[PDB]
Amino acid sequence: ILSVDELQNYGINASDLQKLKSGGIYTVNTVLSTTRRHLCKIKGLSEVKVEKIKEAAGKIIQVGFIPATVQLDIRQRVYSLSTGSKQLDSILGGGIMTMSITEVFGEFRCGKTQMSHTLCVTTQLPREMGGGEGKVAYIDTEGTFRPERIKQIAEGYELDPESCLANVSYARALNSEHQMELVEQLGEELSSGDYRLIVVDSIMANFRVDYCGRGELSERQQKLNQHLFKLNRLAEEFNVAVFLTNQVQSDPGASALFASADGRKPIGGHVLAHASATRILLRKGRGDERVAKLQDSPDMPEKECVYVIGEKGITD
Amino acid sequence: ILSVDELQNYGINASDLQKLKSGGIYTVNTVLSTTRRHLCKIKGLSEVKVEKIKEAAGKIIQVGFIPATVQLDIRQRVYSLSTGSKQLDSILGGGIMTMSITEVFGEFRCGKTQMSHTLCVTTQLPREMGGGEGKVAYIDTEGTFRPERIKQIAEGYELDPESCLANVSYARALNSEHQMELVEQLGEELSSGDYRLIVVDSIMANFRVDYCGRGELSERQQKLNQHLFKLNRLAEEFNVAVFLTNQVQSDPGASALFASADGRKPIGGHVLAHASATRILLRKGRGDERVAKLQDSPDMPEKECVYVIGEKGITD
Amino acid sequence: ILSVDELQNYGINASDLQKLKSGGIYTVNTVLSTTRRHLCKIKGLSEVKVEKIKEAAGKIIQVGFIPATVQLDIRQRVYSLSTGSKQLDSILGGGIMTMSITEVFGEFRCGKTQMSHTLCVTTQLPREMGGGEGKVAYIDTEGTFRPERIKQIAEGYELDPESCLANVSYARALNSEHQMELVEQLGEELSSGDYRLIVVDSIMANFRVDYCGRGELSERQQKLNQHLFKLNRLAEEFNVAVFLTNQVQSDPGASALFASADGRKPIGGHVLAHASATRILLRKGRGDERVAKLQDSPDMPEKECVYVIGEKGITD
DNA sequence: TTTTTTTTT
Ligand SMILES: Nc1ncnc2c1ncn2[C@@H]1O[C@H](COP(=O)(O)OP(=O)(O)OP(=O)(O)O)[C@@H](O)[C@H]1O
Ligand SMILES: Nc1ncnc2c1ncn2[C@@H]1O[C@H](COP(=O)(O)OP(=O)(O)OP(=O)(O)O)[C@@H](O)[C@H]1O
Ligand SMILES: Nc1ncnc2c1ncn2[C@@H]1O[C@H](COP(=O)(O)OP(=O)(O)OP(=O)(O)O)[C@@H](O)[C@H]1O
Ligand SMILES: [Mg+2]
Ligand SMILES: [Mg+2]
Ligand SMILES: [Mg+2]
């Protein structure tokens, strides 16, 4: 896709282009998607300058009213991914759709971080297997990222381990304000190359700790909302898919619907429920089998599925 | 590792450096990991001052996107430890991995407060035996720390008792708010020397008593979450391993899965289940043998094991 | 040990010192051990006042990180006691260790509110006999405290009866909530003089009756947990030993391990099993001999023993 | 929006 350099040739000075780029902008879409009020806060751009920039941008590409079918065709390159279990993949329509947010949540030991580790490997595959030749960015908020597991699960897919380990990009988000800047940065390298998947293990880990003490909640929710908005922007303009791992809490409210199974009701209020495109609930079954359930999706209706976490990642 | 003194030479006044240090900060990583909102609450630092501090810090070390392999190499110094029973150690991959949280729980007289006593001794050993030349900090929340047992188990490992007893550091946490400040303090001496293991016997003993009376639960869980977050931060930035002993409760709910064996379902809700890296269940077997089970780990799958608590600590 | 009067001279008003003392506080350790949240509930102390109090306290004594050996030395005055039967005493390491909780349980006539009666007498002895020159507090929850037996067993130890009977302190706990206040009160007179042993005959007698009807269990367990916590605090800060007599129940569950000997499985759930330092099971043997077994101790491993309840208390 | 607790006979 085209960078912010193409518009360097529409009567635009190469002076603040470096300044824009410094402000986080790295392509044109991110320009069109950015608000003037926000563009005029990069400390060194002029309002009239900003208007000239916006006009140059609108020059290259336009955003009007595609009838519907050009939409159906642009969406043809939606580029789904395989999760690692034909049952689940079929329960999603192919798996983790791209340019969208999928959130999976459940109680501990529930095949969570495991599914992310497998995804990291089921992505450097030919498209006719579920994913294709895409790098992967991995932001971890709790540790528990093990390259070994990556190599292991890879061998189970006959892929050279080193090769895979050479197409992941690991970042350890220390605190929420650091996690947020991580995505800003991301917006650059996502702008050049083939990145297919972003992984946020426990998106709301840090937030839960930074803004404690209700009376401080609205601020936490607003920060989280800005974060999710940015994430979705990225996932849409770079044809990449976002995979979020969430947690759960116990409702001491009451036992009525259906009075049991407290390992539900994830954290993050409605702010995160709305912003999330697909919602999946992972529950502990029997023996070493787990039950996956699909709660929120725009494509499918609903279903149940059963999977096993073996030595080759999620399987059947 | 580098202290907070290195950044004393990047256009930083030596005035509040003492003030930072007083606030708990003792190295640079703890600086990078700290939030501005939190840094601006040390009662005597300026917001612009805080920004200059953060910039100086980011000067020394950076946190970007290691591809994956530099990660696999930095993790090479993960420095596992031996538990005292080849069967268990092999069931963990070597034992108590460093820079991570391992929680062991079970009903009484399972000697979980004995595995800690043995760990205290299996740490001042050459690395080719399971542990290496590391001091040990021991925070007890129930008493029951016996130096004698330490000397005894040591002699069983031919180590001079006095020598071992001279590399432990004992602290008696009276109440939860005191327990929390203990770790703050810890962050200092952990900053200089060779500390390999932190032990919290009955992490949730005090919490269970301080915040009683549901309707007061959320506050307890939030305090506990802050605590665990801090603990994991420490365990990660100082290459030290955290070992927590938990308790259990009886579920008067029902008898369905599998209607018996009530000595399970530890205390601490999901807040502690999630934050815990490895979970081990200790159960009473037959005669004087106990059964260890591994419920949650990111590295291994699952397994059973059998051990005996003799006169040389946990054994076979 | 030092009282709460020492801190009356660190810029502290003598106004609420009386108020603190009224709230149960009688020494400094109890101050350091008390939570602010709890201190600010004495109806007439100020939060800033509480902070000044805590600072004054921390002035006198500090609680940091003793390495280990100062611990081994402070523990040198652990001051064990003799039970009355060389076999048992040797099976404990000397007998009832001080600053700790020892619980003995078994079926009726089994020998346990008798061992308490003997302890009452084996305490006013020179230290080189098992105990030393310590008074004794006796809280009975079922009656069955007989001064006669005390005099009798004493004569068998050639001690003047009146002398012994003059160093016991008897309290009849009518109900659970009264039993709890008993210990609060205790905290005062324990603060001045030589008290070596506290005895709670049938700790859980009253609780069993007050909170009946499961659906009311959690509350009972929480009250009991607060109680045990307080007891252990006392036993630790006053170098006194706590001796609890428990009961037993029949498991209509099944007959598998080992299908007989129902006179086991005491009452009090895991809350009491955990909090208990040493656990002893008294069983009926043959003729007039009883079998003692040691189930939970931090010092010794395990063992069996045999004793006889004669006219001089527990003997061989 | 947030957060689980507890055996009996
Ligand atoms: N030297 C020893 N001294 C005391 N007990 C020993 C010794 N060696 C082995 N044991 C036995 O090993 C077991 C250890 O129990 P442990 O210390 O694990 O209790 P815990 O689980 O830590 O505490 P609790 O069960 O009260 O929460 C006990 O049965 C104990 O009697
Ligand atoms: N190679 C392996 N190493 C470790 N565990 C494995 C392996 N293969 C399968 N497992 C098992 O699969 C399960 C994976 O748990 P998972 O990694 O999903 O925890 P999580 O849900 O990501 O983290 P948490 O539950 O603590 O929030 C564990 O029970 C684990 O023991
Ligand atoms: N001087 C004495 N007076 C009464 N009984 C004595 C005496 N000396 C020995 N015994 C016997 O020793 C045993 C003591 O029983 P004990 O006092 O331990 O009952 P307990 O277990 O305390 O109470 P319960 O069993 O009702 O809960 C009884 O069988 C008792 O008859
Ligand atoms: Mg996880
Ligand atoms: Mg213990
Ligand atoms: Mg009795």
Side-chain angles (χ1 to χ4, degrees), chain B residues 113 142 144 201:
Chain B
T113 174
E142 51 178 60
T144 71
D201 224 8

Side-chain angles (χ1 to χ4, degrees), chain B residues 26-101:
Chain B
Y26 291 106
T27 189
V28 164
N29 296 80
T30 172
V31 174
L32 298 181
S33 73
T34 311
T35 51
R36 295 174 162 81
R37 299 176 57 253
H38 190 292
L39 273 176
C40 285
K41 282 167 59 179
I42 60 180
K43 179 208 57 56
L45 256 69
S46 158
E47 292 73 359
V48 54
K49 197 173 308 181
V50 182
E51 314 274 358
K52 283 184 299 300
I53 306 177
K54 282 282 189 173
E55 181 60 25
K59 294 284 183 51
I60 302 94
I61 176 61
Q62 73 282 18
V63 299
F65 269 58
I66 300 90
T69 80
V70 185
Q71 185 51 13
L72 194 48
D73 296 332
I74 189 65
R75 188 154 186 61
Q76 188 61 254
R77 64 175 180 82
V78 78
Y79 204 95
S80 112
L81 296 196
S82 169
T83 189
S85 89
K86 299 306 185 73
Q87 274 61 228
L88 200 59
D89 279 343
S90 67
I91 215 58
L92 299 188
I96 309 299
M97 302 304 108
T98 320
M99 64 202 309
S100 158
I101 292 173

